[PDB]
Amino acid sequence: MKLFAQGTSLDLSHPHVMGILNVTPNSLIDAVKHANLMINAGATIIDVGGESTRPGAAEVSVEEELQRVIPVVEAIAQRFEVWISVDTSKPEVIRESAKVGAHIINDIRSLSEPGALEAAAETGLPVCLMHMQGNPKTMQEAPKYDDVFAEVNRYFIEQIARCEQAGIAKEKLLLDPGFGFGKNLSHNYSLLARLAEFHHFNLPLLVGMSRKSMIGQLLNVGPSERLSGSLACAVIAAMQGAHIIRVHDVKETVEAMRVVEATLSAKENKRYE
Amino acid sequence: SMKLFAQGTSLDLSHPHVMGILNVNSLIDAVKHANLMINAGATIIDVGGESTRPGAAEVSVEEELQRVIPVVEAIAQRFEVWISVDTSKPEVIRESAKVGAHIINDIRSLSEPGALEAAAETGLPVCLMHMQAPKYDDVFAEVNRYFIEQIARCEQAGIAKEKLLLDPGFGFGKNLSHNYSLLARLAEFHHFNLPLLVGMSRKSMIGQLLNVGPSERLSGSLACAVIAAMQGAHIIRVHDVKETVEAMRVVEATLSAKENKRYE
Ligand SMILES: Nc1nc2[nH]c(SCCc3ccc(S(N)(=O)=O)cc3)nc2c(=O)[nH]1
Numbered sequence: 001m002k003l004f005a006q007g008t009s010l011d012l013s014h015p016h017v018m019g020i021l022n023v024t025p026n027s028l029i030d031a032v033k034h035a036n037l038m039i040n041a042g043a044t045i046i047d048v049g050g051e052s053t054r055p056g057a058a059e060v061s062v063e064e065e066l067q068r069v070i071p072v073v074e075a076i077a078q079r080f081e082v083w084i085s086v087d088t089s090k091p092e093v094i095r096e097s098a099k100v101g102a103h104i105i106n107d108i109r110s111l112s113e114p115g116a117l118e119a120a121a122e123t124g125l126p127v128c129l130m131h132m133q134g135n136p137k138t139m140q141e142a143p144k145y146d147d148v149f150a151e152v153n154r155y156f157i158e159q160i161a162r163c164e165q166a167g168i169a170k171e172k173l174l175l176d177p178g179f180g181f182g183k184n185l186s187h188n189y190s191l192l193a194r195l196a197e198f199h200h201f202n203l204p205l206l207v208g209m210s211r212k213s214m215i216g217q218l219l220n221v222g223p224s225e226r227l228s229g230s231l232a233c234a235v236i237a238a239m240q241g242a243h244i245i246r247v248h249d250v251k252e253t254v255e256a257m258r259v260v261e262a263t264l265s266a267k268e269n270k271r272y273e
Numbered sequence: 274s275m276k277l278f279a280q281g282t283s284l285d286l287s288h289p290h291v292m293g294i295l296n297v298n299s300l301i302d303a304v305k306h307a308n309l310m311i312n313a314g315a316t317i318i319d320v321g322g323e324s325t326r327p328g329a330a331e332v333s334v335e336e337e338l339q340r341v342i343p344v345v346e347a348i349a350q351r352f353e354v355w356i357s358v359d360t361s362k363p364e365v366i367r368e369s370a371k372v373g374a375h376i377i378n379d380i381r382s383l384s385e386p387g388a389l390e391a392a393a394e395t396g397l398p399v400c401l402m403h404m405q406a407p408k409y410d411d412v413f414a415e416v417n418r419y420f421i422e423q424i425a426r427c428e429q430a431g432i433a434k435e436k437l438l439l440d441p442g443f444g445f446g447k448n449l450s451h452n453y454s455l456l457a458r459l460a461e462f463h464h465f466n467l468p469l470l471v472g473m474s475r476k477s478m479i480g481q482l483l484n485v486g487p488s489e490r491l492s493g494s495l496a497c498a499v500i501a502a503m504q505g506a507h508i509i510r511v512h513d514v515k516e517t518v519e520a521m522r523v524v525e526a527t528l529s530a531k532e533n534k535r536y537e
Pocket residue numbers: 052053054055087106108128130176178179180181206207208209211212213214246
């Protein structure tokens with residue numbers, strides 16, 4: 001499995017670490033400093049995000065998101081070789097990001113915004129499709145599923161079809177179950193436990209559990225006390241064949257991923273189920 | 274519903290347990306460290322540490338008794354935690370059981386003269402660990418047959434199968450490649466229907482892979498624990514108790530949401 005963007009490629013034979021770079025409030029200088037630290041710790045992708053999608057988050061104007069994101073993507077692409085994912089839902093941010101060197105469109109809304117689908121297609125870039133029930137304002141009010149795995153699985157079927165009809169080929173797509181995006185604790189763990197079953201689509205799998213409440217509520221610790229839990233989640237995912245792990249704590253995750261790599265390379269079938 | 278019995282209590286092996294490592298004036302600090310490990314969530318304390326590492330200075334019978342017995346006694350009197358004892362000597366096995374030890378953890382699988390008979394007499398649970406530039410045809414198959422052999426040897430000496438734990442012995446006569454081969458296939462050892470104990474914490478199988486110092490292996494050690502626990506390993510022996518317990522809670526939440534209750 002490989003992805004292609006901006007005249008390079010990304011080999012998904014071994015799990016990759018994606019470092020989180022939030023640029024919600026010198027801002028540009030600190031951002032590039034942080035990216036650099038994450039690159040040196042072994043991150044091969046940086047996820048640049050200028051809109052909070054935490055539960056209850058307020059929307060951000062397109063002009064504000066552009067000012068936060070585009071100088072940061074540009075500065076990174078002009079200095080390093082690391083891949084760059086842009087965590088946005090806005091057509092214009094999608095276009096302007098691709099023009100300045102971004103490689104992956106990581107949309108938590110799966111291109112649901114008006115014109116987002118068409119803009120993503122126009123770039124040619126890889127696209128991550130994430131599951132969310134509802135929207136960030138209300139997704140955590142009362143998450144409810146008869147069968148969460150089935151409903152997330154059905155959602156991916158539907159959204160894959162949707163991207164194909166718009167002219168985005170399967171080979172550009174990634175899937176992400178959306179941990180924390182309209183799920184209670186038990187819903188998140190049902191998805192993590194059956195994650196390997198999403199491989200049937202034959203598409204890269206991306207997960208983002210780092211420091212989220214599925215660790216906090218389970219351990220009864222705050223956000224700065226969740227490293228061990230976060231690593232445990234990362235390893236559980238990567239052992240089931242997840243290709244990209246989105247994290248805050250890059251060095252430590254990269255170390256854990258080596259151990260997973262060694263273990264999978266010693267295994268016959270190269271996955272746990 | 275696997276359980277072990279010792280000293281009038283039981284250990285419920287339906288979820289993974291963290292066994293903290295204790296290094297053996299002494300006694301006050303030992304009880305202090307035991308207390309910290311219990312507070313961090315260890316349910317078993319392994320008594321020995323640096324004093325009992327392979328390569329360490331061999332000691333006389335009377336020295337090992339003087340060093341080990343009062344620590345086991347003091348822990349048994351003050352806490353409800355289970356106590357694993359690191360020893361190869363029959364006298365120490367015997368006297369440890371008298372003062373409250375729950376598990377005999379002999380890396381030599383009771384090979385020294387009298388050790389097997391002394392272990393049998395105590396009625397306590399016994400860990401069967403595999404030990405030996407290393408070399409194997411099929412390291413899994415060699416470890417497997419070693420277990421078949423020790424189970425029969427123990428059963429010969431009157432030790433019920435219900436008291437045995439199996440440990441593949443990470444880092445004992447094994448290069449990096451052999452170690453990862455055993456971890457990768459750890460789940461296959463469940464055919465014995467016996468508890469599985471593993472100890473990878475801070476070992477060379479991490480140190481060599483990541484190329485870092487003894488004190489910088491927490492993340493790889495946690496990865497190892499999680500990999501083992503996801504395959505149904507019952508006891509994980511570690512230095513970093515708090516962090517390992519947190520990781521094990523995540524594994525337990527994952528395994529409770531799974532139909533199989535194990536990854537293979
Ligand atoms: N592909 C992908 N992209 C992502 N972007 C984000 S931003 C996280 C917003 C947030 C924070 C905290 C909680 S909570 N209540 O669970 O702790 C939920 C959402 N996440 C993901 C993710 O997973 N995948």
